[PDB]
Amino acid sequence: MGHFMKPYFKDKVTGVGPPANEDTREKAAQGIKAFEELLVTKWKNWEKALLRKS
DNA sequence: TATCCTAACCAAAAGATGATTTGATTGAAGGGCTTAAAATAGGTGTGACAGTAACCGCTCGCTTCGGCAG
């Protein structure tokens, strides 16, 4: 039941999705953002320490 | 007033933060090798041997069966 989450159809061997389609390619040319770009992760103190070390 | 903001705080979604439990990895040991040699004692199967075996474009010569001969 939980295996049908997005992408709905995923490659069974590799998990890859289909290649870029016409509509998506034209959208990317037009520079329209997607709903997956708004996912932003807060900085954990662990992450801050790692970046200081880096 | 009807309604709201969102300072500081309560109920819930989500978003996150470290301690703990379970899926997963492996370090070391059971184990069971190696050729290298030297040796007596052995069993036979088998794989050469060998044999037959079998299966798999132009121009002459030569011939016959009747139509008159005898």
Tokens of A23: 């509509």
Classify A32 as helix, strand or coil. coil
| Experimental method of this PDB entry | cryo-EM
- Name the DSSP letter for residue A4: G
Closest nucleotide to A39's CA, by C1' atom?
Answer: B15
* Residue A19: C-alpha distances to residues A10, A40, A51 (Å): 12, 26, 35
Resolution to 1 decimal place, in Å = 3.3
A6 touches strand B (CB under 7 A): no
Cα torsion A41, A43, A49, A53: sign:
positive
Chain B nucleotides close to protein (CB under 7 A) are: 15-18
